[PDB]
PDB file of C-alpha atoms and ligand atoms in Angstrom:
ATOM      1  CA  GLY A   1    -138.310 -33.791  86.986  1.00 47.09           C
ATOM      2  CA  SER A   2    -140.743 -34.965  84.709  1.00 47.31           C
ATOM      3  CA  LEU A   3    -142.463 -31.452  84.982  1.00 49.27           C
ATOM      4  CA  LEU A   4    -139.156 -29.657  84.906  1.00 50.08           C
ATOM      5  CA  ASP A   5    -137.512 -29.612  81.329  1.00 50.74           C
ATOM      6  CA  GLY A   6    -133.717 -27.699  81.861  1.00 52.18           C
ATOM      7  CA  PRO A   7    -131.744 -26.508  83.525  1.00 52.31           C
ATOM      8  CA  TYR A   8    -130.999 -24.078  80.391  1.00 54.37           C
ATOM      9  CA  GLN A   9    -128.009 -21.897  80.489  1.00 54.46           C
ATOM     10  CA  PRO A  10    -128.450 -17.705  80.477  1.00 55.17           C
ATOM     11  CA  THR A  11    -129.263 -17.086  76.975  1.00 55.76           C
ATOM     12  CA  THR A  12    -131.269 -14.608  74.743  1.00 53.88           C
ATOM     13  CA  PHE A  13    -134.999 -16.537  72.954  1.00 50.92           C
ATOM     14  CA  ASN A  14    -138.170 -15.964  72.135  1.00 52.22           C
ATOM     15  CA  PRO A  15    -140.092 -17.930  74.974  1.00 49.47           C
ATOM     16  CA  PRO A  16    -143.646 -19.756  73.596  1.00 47.08           C
ATOM     17  CA  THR A  17    -146.389 -19.036  74.805  1.00 46.16           C
ATOM     18  CA  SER A  18    -148.380 -21.117  77.880  1.00 44.38           C
ATOM     19  CA  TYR A  19    -145.035 -22.099  79.113  1.00 46.06           C
ATOM     20  CA  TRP A  20    -143.531 -20.658  82.233  1.00 49.12           C
ATOM     21  CA  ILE A  21    -139.640 -20.168  82.573  1.00 51.26           C
ATOM     22  CA  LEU A  22    -138.206 -20.962  85.758  1.00 54.34           C
ATOM     23  CA  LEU A  23    -135.633 -19.203  86.942  1.00 55.79           C
ATOM     24  CA  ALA A  24    -132.657 -20.004  89.617  1.00 53.74           C
ATOM     25  CA  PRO A  25    -130.797 -16.869  89.895  1.00 55.32           C
ATOM     26  CA  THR A  26    -127.805 -17.181  92.439  1.00 58.78           C
ATOM     27  CA  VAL A  27    -126.829 -13.846  93.411  1.00 57.34           C
ATOM     28  CA  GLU A  28    -128.491 -10.350  93.338  1.00 56.57           C
ATOM     29  CA  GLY A  29    -128.400  -8.230  89.897  1.00 56.16           C
ATOM     30  CA  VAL A  30    -130.872  -8.435  86.636  1.00 61.19           C
ATOM     31  CA  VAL A  31    -132.248 -12.069  86.530  1.00 58.00           C
ATOM     32  CA  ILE A  32    -134.170 -11.551  83.461  1.00 57.63           C
ATOM     33  CA  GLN A  33    -135.198  -9.048  80.677  1.00 59.33           C
ATOM     34  CA  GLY A  34    -137.506  -8.680  78.184  1.00 57.33           C
ATOM     35  CA  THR A  35    -138.757  -6.304  75.632  1.00 55.80           C
ATOM     36  CA  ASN A  36    -141.179  -6.128  72.207  1.00 53.87           C
ATOM     37  CA  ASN A  37    -139.451  -3.166  71.272  1.00 56.53           C
ATOM     38  CA  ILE A  38    -142.059  -1.210  70.685  1.00 56.38           C
ATOM     39  CA  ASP A  39    -143.879  -0.043  74.412  1.00 60.46           C
ATOM     40  CA  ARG A  40    -142.643  -2.792  76.974  1.00 60.66           C
ATOM     41  CA  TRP A  41    -139.058  -2.642  78.074  1.00 59.49           C
ATOM     42  CA  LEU A  42    -139.528  -5.631  81.257  1.00 57.80           C
ATOM     43  CA  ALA A  43    -137.021  -6.965  83.617  1.00 61.03           C
ATOM     44  CA  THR A  44    -136.690  -8.762  86.603  1.00 59.42           C
ATOM     45  CA  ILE A  45    -134.051  -7.456  89.476  1.00 62.02           C
ATOM     46  CA  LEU A  46    -133.088  -9.365  92.204  1.00 62.55           C
ATOM     47  CA  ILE A  47    -132.397  -8.002  95.813  1.00 60.06           C
ATOM     48  CA  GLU A  48    -130.651 -10.092  98.764  1.00 57.15           C
ATOM     49  CA  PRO A  49    -131.939  -9.781 102.450  1.00 55.35           C
ATOM     50  CA  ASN A  50    -131.685  -7.031 104.786  1.00 53.39           C
ATOM     51  CA  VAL A  51    -131.043  -3.708 101.997  1.00 51.58           C
ATOM     52  CA  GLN A  52    -131.832  -0.501 103.949  1.00 51.91           C
ATOM     53  CA  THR A  53    -133.437   1.708 100.605  1.00 49.64           C
ATOM     54  CA  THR A  54    -130.260   2.857  98.212  1.00 45.18           C
ATOM     55  CA  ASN A  55    -129.397   3.433  94.765  1.00 46.83           C
ATOM     56  CA  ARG A  56    -128.006   0.647  92.609  1.00 45.76           C
ATOM     57  CA  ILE A  57    -127.031   0.526  89.524  1.00 48.16           C
ATOM     58  CA  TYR A  58    -128.333  -2.266  87.062  1.00 49.06           C
ATOM     59  CA  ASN A  59    -127.639  -2.982  83.160  1.00 45.87           C
ATOM     60  CA  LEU A  60    -130.602  -3.020  81.463  1.00 45.79           C
ATOM     61  CA  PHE A  61    -130.830  -3.779  77.702  1.00 48.68           C
ATOM     62  CA  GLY A  62    -127.033  -2.574  77.520  1.00 51.21           C
ATOM     63  CA  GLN A  63    -127.220   0.571  79.222  1.00 49.66           C
ATOM     64  CA  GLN A  64    -126.774   1.649  83.440  1.00 48.84           C
ATOM     65  CA  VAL A  65    -129.807   1.929  84.780  1.00 51.52           C
ATOM     66  CA  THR A  66    -130.373   3.890  88.665  1.00 47.71           C
ATOM     67  CA  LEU A  67    -132.997   2.325  90.496  1.00 49.93           C
ATOM     68  CA  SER A  68    -134.180   3.289  94.268  1.00 46.65           C
ATOM     69  CA  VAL A  69    -134.650  -0.693  96.015  1.00 48.91           C
ATOM     70  CA  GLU A  70    -135.049  -1.934  99.152  1.00 49.19           C
ATOM     71  CA  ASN A  71    -135.192  -5.331 101.013  1.00 45.59           C
ATOM     72  CA  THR A  72    -136.348  -5.048 104.384  1.00 41.40           C
ATOM     73  CA  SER A  73    -136.792  -8.963 104.675  1.00 38.70           C
ATOM     74  CA  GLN A  74    -134.398 -11.526 106.801  1.00 39.18           C
ATOM     75  CA  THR A  75    -134.883 -14.143 105.493  1.00 39.24           C
ATOM     76  CA  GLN A  76    -136.116 -13.958 102.217  1.00 40.86           C
ATOM     77  CA  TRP A  77    -134.931 -12.771  98.774  1.00 43.18           C
ATOM     78  CA  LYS A  78    -137.048  -9.844  96.482  1.00 40.69           C
ATOM     79  CA  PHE A  79    -137.796 -10.210  93.302  1.00 42.06           C
ATOM     80  CA  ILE A  80    -139.031  -7.106  91.547  1.00 39.19           C
ATOM     81  CA  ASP A  81    -140.449  -5.877  88.193  1.00 37.82           C
ATOM     82  CA  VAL A  82    -139.599  -2.762  86.070  1.00 36.23           C
ATOM     83  CA  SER A  83    -141.022  -1.557  83.510  1.00 34.75           C
ATOM     84  CA  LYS A  84    -140.869   1.035  80.585  1.00 35.86           C
ATOM     85  CA  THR A  85    -143.409   2.019  78.160  1.00 34.33           C
ATOM     86  CA  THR A  86    -141.242   4.190  75.882  1.00 34.93           C
ATOM     87  CA  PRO A  87    -137.162   4.000  74.932  1.00 33.47           C
ATOM     88  CA  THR A  88    -136.454   6.890  76.228  1.00 35.44           C
ATOM     89  CA  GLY A  89    -138.953   6.718  79.878  1.00 36.65           C
ATOM     90  CA  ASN A  90    -138.608   5.811  83.585  1.00 37.03           C
ATOM     91  CA  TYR A  91    -138.723   2.495  85.015  1.00 36.37           C
ATOM     92  CA  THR A  92    -141.220   1.803  87.529  1.00 34.24           C
ATOM     93  CA  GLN A  93    -140.886  -0.840  90.027  1.00 35.90           C
ATOM     94  CA  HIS A  94    -143.873  -3.724  90.179  1.00 35.52           C
ATOM     95  CA  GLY A  95    -144.851  -7.498  91.378  1.00 34.44           C
ATOM     96  CA  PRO A  96    -142.526  -7.540  93.871  1.00 29.03           C
ATOM     97  CA  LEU A  97    -142.185 -10.985  95.213  1.00 30.60           C
ATOM     98  CA  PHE A  98    -140.521 -12.224  98.760  1.00 36.68           C
ATOM     99  CA  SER A  99    -138.832 -15.271  98.008  1.00 38.15           C
ATOM    100  CA  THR A 100    -137.240 -17.528 100.361  1.00 39.68           C
ATOM    101  CA  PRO A 101    -136.615 -20.730  97.884  1.00 36.26           C
ATOM    102  CA  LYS A 102    -135.106 -17.817  95.661  1.00 38.11           C
ATOM    103  CA  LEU A 103    -136.716 -18.965  92.573  1.00 44.51           C
ATOM    104  CA  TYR A 104    -138.901 -16.980  90.008  1.00 44.60           C
ATOM    105  CA  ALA A 105    -141.250 -17.412  87.157  1.00 44.47           C
ATOM    106  CA  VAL A 106    -142.601 -15.646  84.050  1.00 43.91           C
ATOM    107  CA  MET A 107    -144.686 -16.512  81.398  1.00 44.73           C
ATOM    108  CA  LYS A 108    -146.353 -14.992  78.086  1.00 47.57           C
ATOM    109  CA  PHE A 109    -149.957 -15.633  77.874  1.00 49.86           C
ATOM    110  CA  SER A 110    -152.643 -14.101  76.765  1.00 47.12           C
ATOM    111  CA  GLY A 111    -151.872 -10.525  75.677  1.00 46.03           C
ATOM    112  CA  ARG A 112    -149.403 -10.472  79.150  1.00 49.95           C
ATOM    113  CA  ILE A 113    -146.840 -11.421  80.763  1.00 48.62           C
ATOM    114  CA  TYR A 114    -147.515 -12.767  83.525  1.00 45.26           C
ATOM    115  CA  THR A 115    -144.738 -13.377  86.942  1.00 47.36           C
ATOM    116  CA  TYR A 116    -145.432 -14.130  90.130  1.00 44.36           C
ATOM    117  CA  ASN A 117    -145.287 -11.863  93.373  1.00 45.10           C
ATOM    118  CA  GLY A 118    -146.306 -11.509  97.298  1.00 41.29           C
ATOM    119  CA  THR A 119    -144.825 -13.318  99.949  1.00 44.00           C
ATOM    120  CA  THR A 120    -144.005 -17.184  99.810  1.00 44.35           C
ATOM    121  CA  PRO A 121    -145.531 -19.535 100.598  1.00 44.81           C
ATOM    122  CA  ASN A 122    -148.500 -18.058  99.669  1.00 46.43           C
ATOM    123  CA  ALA A 123    -147.605 -16.426  96.463  1.00 45.61           C
ATOM    124  CA  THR A 124    -149.493 -15.781  93.761  1.00 46.03           C
ATOM    125  CA  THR A 125    -149.748 -13.849  89.927  1.00 48.39           C
ATOM    126  CA  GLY A 126    -149.738 -11.039  88.411  1.00 52.45           C
ATOM    127  CA  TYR A 127    -149.336  -9.790  84.316  1.00 49.24           C
ATOM    128  CA  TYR A 128    -148.050  -7.085  82.099  1.00 50.52           C
ATOM    129  CA  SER A 129    -150.364  -6.178  79.362  1.00 54.26           C
ATOM    130  CA  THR A 130    -148.322  -5.860  76.566  1.00 54.62           C
ATOM    131  CA  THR A 131    -148.641  -5.342  72.893  1.00 54.69           C
ATOM    132  CA  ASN A 132    -147.605  -7.705  70.368  1.00 57.12           C
ATOM    133  CA  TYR A 133    -147.156 -10.020  73.455  1.00 56.76           C
ATOM    134  CA  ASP A 134    -145.582 -13.218  71.793  1.00 59.60           C
ATOM    135  CA  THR A 135    -142.998 -11.137  69.859  1.00 62.23           C
ATOM    136  CA  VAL A 136    -141.453 -10.401  72.875  1.00 63.88           C
ATOM    137  CA  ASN A 137    -138.119 -11.342  73.565  1.00 64.38           C
ATOM    138  CA  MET A 138    -136.123 -12.382  76.460  1.00 64.58           C
ATOM    139  CA  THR A 139    -132.469 -12.554  77.870  1.00 65.74           C
ATOM    140  CA  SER A 140    -132.298 -14.705  81.339  1.00 64.21           C
ATOM    141  CA  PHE A 141    -129.037 -13.941  83.084  1.00 64.71           C
ATOM    142  CA  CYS A 142    -129.174 -17.330  84.948  1.00 64.87           C
ATOM    143  CA  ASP A 143    -129.920 -20.388  84.828  1.00 65.03           C
ATOM    144  CA  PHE A 144    -133.673 -21.652  84.017  1.00 66.33           C
ATOM    145  CA  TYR A 145    -136.289 -24.441  83.678  1.00 67.74           C
ATOM    146  CA  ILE A 146    -139.294 -24.889  81.481  1.00 69.20           C
ATOM    147  CA  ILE A 147    -142.731 -26.076  83.119  1.00 66.20           C
ATOM    148  CA  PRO A 148    -145.834 -26.201  80.843  1.00 69.65           C
ATOM    149  CA  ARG A 149    -148.900 -23.879  81.970  1.00 70.85           C
ATOM    150  CA  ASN A 150    -151.115 -26.660  82.026  1.00 73.17           C
ATOM    151  CA  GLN A 151    -149.120 -27.625  85.390  1.00 71.45           C
ATOM    152  CA  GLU A 152    -149.184 -24.180  86.759  1.00 71.84           C
ATOM    153  CA  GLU A 153    -150.278 -25.402  90.102  1.00 71.65           C
ATOM    154  CA  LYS A 154    -146.669 -26.982  89.936  1.00 71.03           C
ATOM    155  CA  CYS A 155    -144.919 -23.966  88.949  1.00 70.65           C
ATOM    156  CA  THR A 156    -146.282 -22.482  92.004  1.00 70.76           C
ATOM    157  CA  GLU A 157    -145.694 -25.182  94.541  1.00 70.99           C
ATOM    158  CA  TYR A 158    -141.707 -24.702  93.158  1.00 69.28           C
ATOM    159  CA  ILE A 159    -142.732 -20.853  93.214  1.00 69.30           C
ATOM    160  CA  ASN A 160    -143.904 -21.292  96.989  1.00 69.05           C
ATOM    161  CA  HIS A 161    -141.174 -24.516  98.381  1.00 68.55           C
ATOM    162  CA  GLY A 162    -138.155 -24.731  95.858  1.00 70.58           C
ATOM    163  CA  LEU A 163    -137.198 -27.807  93.691  1.00 71.68           C
TER     164      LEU A 163
HETATM  165  C1  MN0 B   1    -152.223  -1.264  83.134  1.00 73.33           C
HETATM  166  O1  MN0 B   1    -152.856  -2.090  83.933  1.00 73.33           O
HETATM  167  C2  MN0 B   1    -152.047  -3.158  84.480  1.00 73.33           C
HETATM  168  C3  MN0 B   1    -151.375  -4.018  83.293  1.00 73.33           C
HETATM  169  O2  MN0 B   1    -152.664  -4.824  82.422  1.00 73.33           O
HETATM  170  O3  MN0 B   1    -150.371  -4.129  82.484  1.00 73.33           O
HETATM  171  C4  MN0 B   1    -152.630  -4.050  85.094  1.00 73.33           C
HETATM  172  C5  MN0 B   1    -151.522  -4.998  86.047  1.00 73.33           C
HETATM  173  O4  MN0 B   1    -152.357  -5.732  87.067  1.00 73.33           O
HETATM  174  C6  MN0 B   1    -150.492  -4.440  86.890  1.00 73.33           C
HETATM  175  N1  MN0 B   1    -149.503  -5.359  87.214  1.00 73.33           N
HETATM  176  C7  MN0 B   1    -149.223  -5.596  88.028  1.00 73.33           C
HETATM  177  O5  MN0 B   1    -148.424  -3.839  88.728  1.00 73.33           O
HETATM  178  C8  MN0 B   1    -148.053  -6.526  88.855  1.00 73.33           C
HETATM  179  O6  MN0 B   1    -148.033  -7.646  88.621  1.00 73.33           O
HETATM  180  C9  MN0 B   1    -149.772  -3.748  85.385  1.00 73.33           C
HETATM  181  C10 MN0 B   1    -148.343  -2.848  85.771  1.00 73.33           C
HETATM  182  O7  MN0 B   1    -148.675  -1.908  86.868  1.00 73.33           O
HETATM  183  C11 MN0 B   1    -148.383  -2.140  84.159  1.00 73.33           C
HETATM  184  O8  MN0 B   1    -148.111  -2.960  83.179  1.00 73.33           O
HETATM  185  C12 MN0 B   1    -146.782  -1.623  84.408  1.00 73.33           C
HETATM  186  O9  MN0 B   1    -146.476  -0.471  83.703  1.00 73.33           O
HETATM  187  O10 MN0 B   1    -150.613  -2.633  84.552  1.00 73.33           O
HETATM  188 NA1   NA B   2    -143.890 -10.179  90.472  1.00 75.56          NA
END
C-alpha cells in the first residue's frame, strides 16, 4: 500500500502531527499509551469478544492499574480509551470502538489527540483536548503503520474494512 507506511515494531516515539498511527494488535491488553507529562495520560486498551463486566489489571505507564471493563459483543473486539488528568488520579473510560478488523488509529492534531470510535463499518472520530499536544510521547505495544491525514478517508476505510 502506497498510503500505508510500515509495519513498524512496538516502540516509544513522538509521532508527527497530522499523521494517523494505524495500530494492529493481536491479543487483549494495552495497545498504546501516551502523555504530555503535565495533565493528560491517555492509553487505549483492547478487550476480546464475550467479556462480562470484570476487573482487569493493565500495565499503564509502568504500573498496575485495575479497570472495570466489558465486551458484550460476540463478533467484535473492543478498543477503549482511558484517560487521567493528574499523575495521582483515576482513569476514566471514553470513546469505545467496537471493531471487526481489529484495527485502531490515533493522531495528534489541532490541540487534540484523535482516535476512532463507534462500530465498524460505521466508525467515526473523537478527540481528547490536550495541553501542548505536539509534545505527546507515545509507546505502541503492537505493530503499527503511518498514514497522512490528507488520506483520512483511507484510514477510515482501513478502520471499517481492514487491510
Ligand atoms: C471535555 O471535553 C472533551 C475534550 O475536548 O477533550 C470533549 C471530547 O469530545 C471528549 N471525547 C470523548 O469523550 C471521546 O472521543 C473528551 C473526553 O471526554 C475527555 O478529554 C477525557 O478526559 O472531552
Ligand atoms: Na476511541
